[PDB]
């Protein structure tokens, strides 16, 4: 039993209000060290098809904890492989789990995590991401974005209807003129959809910077396709969900973008996928799911720490009504600043 022996894990269901989208159901996951050092993750199953849940993630890391239960902290690298090897379908309890591991090591020494990560900035500039409506109320929420002193924006489009599309693009652009425009398609395109989507975009001057996704993750020639001939940054999300998915990015010309969530691959996996990227001269973007300021500013301290990162897109903290946290990110517009705070600075109110 020294300093850096995990004695405690527990995992607790987390269900945060949400502006507009009803509850982001996630889970708070707390390592303690002997030495009475707490480290925080947090989990957040999207359950989308194919995908995990709550109550699925909460009984994932109570299984894995027997497997954390007496071991060294310290040994953060191996722990986050044999989590991985014995629950590798559970991706948000490992995330989790290894956010709260990182972030115990670090605080134990105090040191930032984003120090520990590379030390290259305090600062990101995230977008923020319009909900839905029509082409009038988008056209608002372009304009309500801008007035909070965000930089650029981020549009979900469906990708079903070019003509649509295109339509809500114009109102956004007209109402926030000097917007870099990332647009999220959410595998709803095909090829010629996107292309043309593309064309129309070049044609008109409308100043989208990133085609997020805009092809299912199976149709790997077709993402190719687009990312070689549509003139546009194309981001891999659901096509890039690990270091073998990254490989593959990188060695077709899949996409020219990687959007990172820690979420969907754990840290460790997320890391790996970083280094690729940048030796494959990818750029980096960095997301989440539906996060509270806990997940999103341990990834806000990796973007940060390690560098290199183009699109910074962590705003889900400004749709949540309310929460159990204080420190973080501190946010001011659209900029994220970082602080000379050890770990990643979230912590749990008190009284
Ligand atoms: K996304």
């Not at 044999?82 to 309890?93: C, G, I, P, R, T």
């Not at 007209?174 to 917007?179: L, R, V």
């Not at 396709?225 to 981001?235: E, R």
Request: hydrophobic content about 50%; glycine content about 10%.
């Amino acid at each position: 039993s020294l300093p850096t022996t995990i004695q405690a894990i527990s995992a607790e269901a987390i269900n945060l209000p949400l502006t507009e989208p009803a509850v982001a159901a996630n889970v708070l996951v707390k390592v303690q060290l002997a030495d009475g050092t707490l480290g925080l993750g947090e989990a957040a199953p999207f359950p989308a098809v194919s995908g995990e849940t709550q109550t699925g993630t909460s009984a994932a890391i109570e299984r894995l904890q027997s497997h954390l239960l007496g071991a060294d902290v310290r040994g953060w690298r191996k722990l986050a492989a044999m989590l991985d090897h014995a629950e590798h379908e559970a991706a948000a309890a490992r995330c989790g789990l290894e956010m709260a591991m990182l972030d115990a090591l670090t605080r134990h020494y105090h040191m930032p995590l984003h120090v520990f990560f590379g030390g290259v900035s305090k600062q990101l500039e995230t977008d923020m991401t319009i909900t839905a409506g029509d082409e009038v109320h988008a056209a608002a929420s372009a304009k309500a974005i801008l007035a909070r002193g965000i930089k650029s924006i981020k549009v979900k489009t469906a990708g079903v209807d070019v003509a649509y599309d295109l339509a809500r693009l114009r109102a956004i652009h007209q109402a926030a003129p000097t917007a870099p425009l990332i647009v999220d398609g959410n595998c709803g395109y095909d090829v010629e959809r996107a292309l043309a989507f593309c064309a129309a975009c070049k044609a008109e001057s409308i100043p989208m910077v990133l085609f997020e996704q805009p092809l299912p993750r199976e149709d790997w020639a077709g993402m190719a396709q687009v990312t070689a001939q549509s003139g546009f940054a194309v981001a891999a999300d659901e096509s890039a969900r690990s270091a073998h998915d990254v490989l593959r990015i990188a060695r077709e010309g899949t996409a020219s973008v990687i959007n990172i969530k820690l979420m969907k691959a754990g840290v460790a996996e997320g890391l790996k996928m970083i280094a690729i990227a940048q030796a494959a001269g990818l750029g980096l973007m960095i997301g989440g799911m539906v996060e509270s300021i806990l997940a999103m500013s341990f990834s806000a301290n990796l973007a940060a720490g390690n560098g290199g990162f183009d699109f910074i897109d962590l705003d889900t903290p400004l749709f949540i009504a309310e929460h159990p946290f204080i420190g973080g990110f501190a946010q001011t517009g659209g900029t994220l600043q970082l602080a000379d705070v050890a770990g990643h600075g979230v912590n749990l109110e008190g009284h």
